[PDB]
């Protein structure tokens, strides 16, 4: 158990389950072979993403 002032979680096991998940996530993301794309390509993939959503109206 944890007080909200003390931690962003709820219990001591939440500070275990979330952090093991995050550790496993990053380790998956780093082991991933797909090369890192530069900021301006992400920027491009973004404008395309929001544009596709705005069209669904």
């Amino acid at each position: 158990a944890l007080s909200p002032m003390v931690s962003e979680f709820e219990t001591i096991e939440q500070e275990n389950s979330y952090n093991e998940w995050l550790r496993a996530k990053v380790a998956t993301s780093l082991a991933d072979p797909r090369p890192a794309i530069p900021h301006d390509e992400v920027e491009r993939r973004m404008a395309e993403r929001f544009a596709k959503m705005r069209k669904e109206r």
């Binding site: 962003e8 979680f9 389950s17 979330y18 952090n19 998940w21 995050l22 550790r23 996530k25 990053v26 998956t28 993301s29 780093l30 991933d32 797909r34 090369p35 890192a36 794309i37 530069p38 900021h39 992400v42 920027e43 993939r45 973004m46 993403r49 929001f50 959503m53 705005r54």
Partner: protein
């Protein structure tokens, strides 16, 4: 001076987070990306600016918003966005 790069996996996170927010407010999903942006780019000239991650060692934490964290690593040749996560809940997930 280091170029700002994102891992393919941190961009797959960006869709999964924006798409989830678009269901309620499409502009909130947009505003988030602008606060995300405003953290990621400043790193090109000030990489060692955000403290190291406690939960994940060798990475650095950006609490961009109370509910959202950017995780980056400063390489030999670049600043690398590793993942973007919800600071309180286990989201987004591996597929």
């Amino acid at each position: 001076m280091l170029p700002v790069l994102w891992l393919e996996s941190a961009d797959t996170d960006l869709d999964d987070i924006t798409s989830y927010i678009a269901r309620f407010d499409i502009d909130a999903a947009e505003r988030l990306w602008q606060r995300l942006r405003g953290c990621v780019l400043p790193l090109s000239e000030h990489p060692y600016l955000y403290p190291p991650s406690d939960r994940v060692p060798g990475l650095r934490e950006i609490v961009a918003h109370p509910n959202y964290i950017i995780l980056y690593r400063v390489t030999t040749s670049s600043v690398e966005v590793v993942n973007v996560i919800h600071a309180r809940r286990q989201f987004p997930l591996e597929h």
